[PDB]
């Protein structure tokens, strides 16, 4: 009756924080979960009643494994630059067939040598892993593997090249170009997972191919249903929030008794570490006539907060959030998701990947607006609060989400799908 279930994701805490949302549905029916993860995270897996499994305890000596989230900045540093400087099709030219990820595949190989040993050892009936792409273990390994995706599910359709933030406004003269520099970019990638597959002689599979069971989580009112269906084996769980930490978010006194509205802004678990970025973005909300609440990021500490902010390098977003009127984000999907289900509009500021995507989802479905950098001004930003906050139709478009995302019952066909292929080995 009692199931032995694996987690893995990569280092963002976006991947491991989705993987907490359904570990807790699967604890509450009584399997227990392992999760193969990064020891700055050990606090939260334990606290969650997760059996914890340092990667790092597994690395080979020809292939070590680094957590790479003390240091994401200087890739994340390097998105911003381009960004501010250059339109999403601008961008595009400029990659000139260089994959958004295709960087990390050749770096996977350690993380893949410590998951064939772990899986070995603790022989689980079930693995899932929250991954940019799938990894040679997940084919070699005993037992099923159910890839989690996070991010924006568009690459599971037929439709808008991913990655690139397309609209379903856009004509398609300008949209036939983006489609052809994102085709020629998503063979750079097939090319590098050839080679790690290749490394470990199993088969290369798709990136986001799933052989039996596969879970994307994304509210359904924002899935893609005008695109048809997701890739075989794929099925949606409309939200993974893990369990709040305080139930009860008590408010800074410096933001209490002081008038405006109360406006939530984090740039994410990655781009937070760009202080240029947030200073960009604080600079002109001095003279916005509201209050801001701000996850400042690693390097919060140096980062300028005016008489009408306060913030930590951490907040308790998931806390926080009901007490909040706007929130002020990267287009992270997490962030997106715990901020619909409170019943928040957002203000999408994207910075790299699914990011466009969310953030160009947001607009189009009117649950907030899309602000680039490349465009970015004090003038706009302001105007976008006021905009977002006094906007009806918005505002009720948000609270209609809010309602399908409390309402939703999709956990009850995900977790029996699980439990199925875990005991069955097959659907
Ligand atoms: O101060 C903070 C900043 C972020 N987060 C969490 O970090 C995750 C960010 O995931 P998302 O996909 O939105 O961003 P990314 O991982 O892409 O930066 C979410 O679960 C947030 O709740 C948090 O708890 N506190
Ligand atoms: O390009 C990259 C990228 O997009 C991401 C990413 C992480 C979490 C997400 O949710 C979405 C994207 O991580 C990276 C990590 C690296 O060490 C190097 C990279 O080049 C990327």
Redesign the pocket.
């Known amino acids: 009756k009692s199931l032995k279930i694996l987690f893995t994701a990569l280092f ?4 491991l ?2 993987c907490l949302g359904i570990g807790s549905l699967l604890r509450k029916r009584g399997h227990q979960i392992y999760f193969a993860h990064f020891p700055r995270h050990r606090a939260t897996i334990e606290k969650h009643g997760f059996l914890f499994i340092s990667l790092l305890d597994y690395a080979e000596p020809e292939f070590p494994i680094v957590d790479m989230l003390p240091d994401i900045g200087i890739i994340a540093k390097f998105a911003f630059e381009r960004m501010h400087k250059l339109t999403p099709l601008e961008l595009f030219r400029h990659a000139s067939g260089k994959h958004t990820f295709a960087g990390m595949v050749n770096g996977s190989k350690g993380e893949n040598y410590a998951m064939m040993k772990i899986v070995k050892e603790y022989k689980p009936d079930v693995c899932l892993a929250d991954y940019l792409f799938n990894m040679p273990w997940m084919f070699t390994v005993d037992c099923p593997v159910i890839p989690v995706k ?2 924006n599910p568009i690459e599971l359709y037929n439709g808008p090249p991913a990655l690139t933030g397309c609209s379903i406004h856009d004509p398609p003269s300008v949209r036939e170009e983006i489609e052809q520099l994102a085709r020629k970019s998503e063979l750079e990638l097939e090319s590098e997972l050839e080679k790690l597959f290749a490394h470990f002689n199993v088969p290369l599979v798709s990136y986001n191919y799933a052989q039996q069971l596969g879970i994307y989580i994304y509210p359904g009112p924002l899935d893609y249903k005008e695109l048809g269906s997701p890739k075989e084996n794929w099925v949606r769980l409309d939200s993974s ?2 369990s709040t930490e305080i139930s009860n978010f008590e408010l800074p006194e410096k933001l209490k008794d002081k008038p405006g509205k109360l406006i939530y802004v ?7 570490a760009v202080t240029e970025l947030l200073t960009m973005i604080l600079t002109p909300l001095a003279n916005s006539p509201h209050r801001f609440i701000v ?1 400042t ?1 690693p390097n919060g500490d140096s980062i300028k907060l005016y008489d009408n902010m306060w913030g ?7 806390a926080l959030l009901p007490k909040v009127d706007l929130f002020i ?8 998701i ?1 901020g619909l289900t409170a019943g928040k509009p957002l203000i999408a500021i994207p910075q790299f ?3 466009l995507d969310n953030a160009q989802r947001i607009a189009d479905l009117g649950l907030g607006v899309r602000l680039n950098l490349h465009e970015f001004s004090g003038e706009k930003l302001l105007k976008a609060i006021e905009d977002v906050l006094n906007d009806e139709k918005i505002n009720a478009n948000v609270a209609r989400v809010s309602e399908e995302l409390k309402k939703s019952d999709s956990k009850d066909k995900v977790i029996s799908l699980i439990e199925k292929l875990a005991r069955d080995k097959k659907l």
């Open positions: 963002g805490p976006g991947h924080n989705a996070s991010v929030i893990r984090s740039m994410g678990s990655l781009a937070s996850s990021g930590d390098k951490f907040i308790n977003q998931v984000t990267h287009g992270g999907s997490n962030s997106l715990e990947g699914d990011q």
